[PDB]
Write a protein that binds this ligand. Structure first.
Ligand code: BEF
Ligand code: BEF
Ligand SMILES: [Mg+2]
Ligand SMILES: [Mg+2]
Lengths: 120, 119
């Protein structure tokens, strides 16, 4: 019984870093670097929480978020270099549970994962 | 739904949030002192509590711990403390979100909506 996380992120250094840091916290992690592959994975497997970058190949994160939310209430955290207030609001209103501006400290992401999953 | 408590000692900010939130059809109570805020939270029902960290009498992290000891009530921390250690502590002590000042009201309102989806 492991908590399952999907990361959709096209910057492969950060993607691997997040995978390693989350695996160290005893999460099971799947990663996708392409937006369509990430959506397809999110819809075909059960995750406990999904981490979504916004600028991705094929389709971008807000479309992924919308299409996941047509099917699932699965927690979503958006991570992105997009830091304007409107981008944050739009992402939360499309159903993301949190929204973190890059670059961030891993310990903050881990704390926010814990806080969201506490209420599941 | 509608009941919000704000514990914030910077009164210009508190009245702003109070008015903006009331404009959004929330019923807002506010307290400028940390002990009064904690007392209010434990004595009265709220749907969501907004906690500053740096307050007179008792600091917001301790308020958060004591509330979460007794209630499931959603908590958003708002604070000028931007350090990662403080974010991690606030979230681990029971806060559902943590916003660094300054922030735009539409962000707060969106995070309130998102947190109330979690119940
Ligand atoms: F490409 Be992600 F929005 F940083
Ligand atoms: F006084 Be609060 F922590 F900004
Ligand atoms: Mg990207
Ligand atoms: Mg203060």
């Amino acid at each position: 019984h492991h908590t399952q996380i999907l990361i959709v992120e096209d910057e492969q250094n950060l993607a691997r870093f997040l995978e390693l840091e989350l695996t160290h916290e005893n999460y099971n992690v799947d990663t996708e670097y392409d937006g369509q592959d990430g959506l397809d994975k999110a819809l075909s497997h059960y995750y406990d929480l999904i981490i979504l970058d916004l600028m991705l190949p094929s389709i971008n994160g807000l479309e992924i978020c919308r299409k996941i939310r047509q099917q699932q209430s699965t927690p979503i955290i958006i991570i992105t270099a997009k830091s304007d207030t409107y981008d944050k609001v739009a992402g939360l209103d499309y159903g993301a549970d949190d929204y973190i501006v890059k670059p961030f400290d891993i310990e903050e992401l881990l704390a926010r994962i814990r806080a969201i999953l506490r209420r599941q």
